[PDB]
Amino acid sequence: NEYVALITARGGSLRKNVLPLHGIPLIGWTIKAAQGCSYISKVFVSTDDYEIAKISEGLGALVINRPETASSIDVILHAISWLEQKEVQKYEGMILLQPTSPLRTSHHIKEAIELYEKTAAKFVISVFEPTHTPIKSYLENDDGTISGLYSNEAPYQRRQDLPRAYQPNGAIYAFSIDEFKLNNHFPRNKVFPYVMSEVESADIDTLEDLRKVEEQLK
Amino acid sequence: NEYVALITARKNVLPLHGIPLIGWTIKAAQGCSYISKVFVSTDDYEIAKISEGLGALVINRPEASSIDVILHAISWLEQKEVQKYEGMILLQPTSPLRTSHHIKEAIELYEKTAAKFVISVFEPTHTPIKSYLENDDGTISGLYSNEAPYQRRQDLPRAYQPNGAIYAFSIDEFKLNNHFPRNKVFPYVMSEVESADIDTLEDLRKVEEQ
Ligand SMILES: [Ca+2]
Ligand SMILES: [Ca+2]
């Protein structure tokens, strides 16, 4: 089994992917995390921006030049098409890695591929259990009323007595290139969770997010 | 017509801008024109001394369940109070950012909608409507629908989380069920900022800095 790492990074309009973090641009961490994992064969950055592509090429990553608020699937399908045409080796699985998740390491990627193999999953998605579990939330009805999202008794039943609810952190998406091509979407069946902490689930959007992560890092 | 405020009680006495945490919820209830009397359901002499100091009336409870504290309070009110109260306004002492205005707007909605229950909520930054539920085989699928984690927020129905600041219900309905109404429940929506529930000392520190 051969895996390819795909890192999707666009340009500014906040140019977050190139923001410095402990002396390496944000995207650098995710390229290095991918490159440092023994299961990853090649690392590709789909970018529409010169600075992202030059940084990427500087760290030994291969640039997928992307054309012109585009769909995320249309980016993966383009990447799959580019890989089919420009690469000799057939890749089994794609490891989609968001450049704004610097706290997701090579170990996380390793453990997520190990689970994708062990469970023989169609899809592995990196998740976290929120502090306020969605399993005890309420859903707004058409009349304006509210009732339990899981069941009517759920907001009142304790956490232990209810099934685990997860939120995606967007750090890792491990899937089969062949299945994705068939559907033109992510697998809706045999989807398994790779559970990470709420701490490790940091998604840099603002400079306060970046500052918290600069501090966190020690 | 008539509403009674019930505040169920080391966190509750923690100082916040010169008043113990419970003081804020006591004052918020007392400052609302729709609230007739304010009680603090507590099993500690130090909390009951502070509560009485801030003009709240103490319901002395025996030295854990939330419903057992609501029904005890209802029983105490039946026996020790002459006036019959229609609705109970349950107010958590760990929600100091919930004001008399919030309580007012909450009761105004309980009346306007003619609800059986009104619960103070907030729309989380990560909507529960786009979350995943763990199956028995170990697999995961959308909590609302299988397509939900992939459908955009706008195209999906509003999911709320309770902040626990306000629970407006009928004393007569809760007595017969021995639980909260499961029908005609309406949401009173507050911000994620106003939804602060003091648990840790970092939570208090963040609330002081406001
Ligand atoms: Ca781990
Ligand atoms: Ca308001």
Author numbering:
A (entry chain B): 3 to 15, 19 to 73, 79 to 228
B (entry chain A): 3 to 11, 20 to 73, 80 to 226
From the paper:
The first step of the incorporation pathway involves the activation of sialic acid to a cytidine monophosphate diester form catalyzed by CMP-sialic acid synthetase (EC 2.7.7.43), a ubiquitous enzyme that is found in both prokaryotes and eukaryotes. In the presence of Mg2+, CMP-sialic acid synthetase (CMAS) catalyzes a sequential ordered reaction that involves a nucleophilic attack on the α-phosphate of CTP by the anomeric O atom of β-Neu5Ac and the production of CMP-sialic acid and pyrophosphate (PPi). The activated sialic acid is then incorporated into LOS or LPS by sialyltransferases. In this report, we present crystal structures of the apo form of the VcCMAS enzyme and of that complexed with cytidine diphos­phate (CDP) and Mg2+.
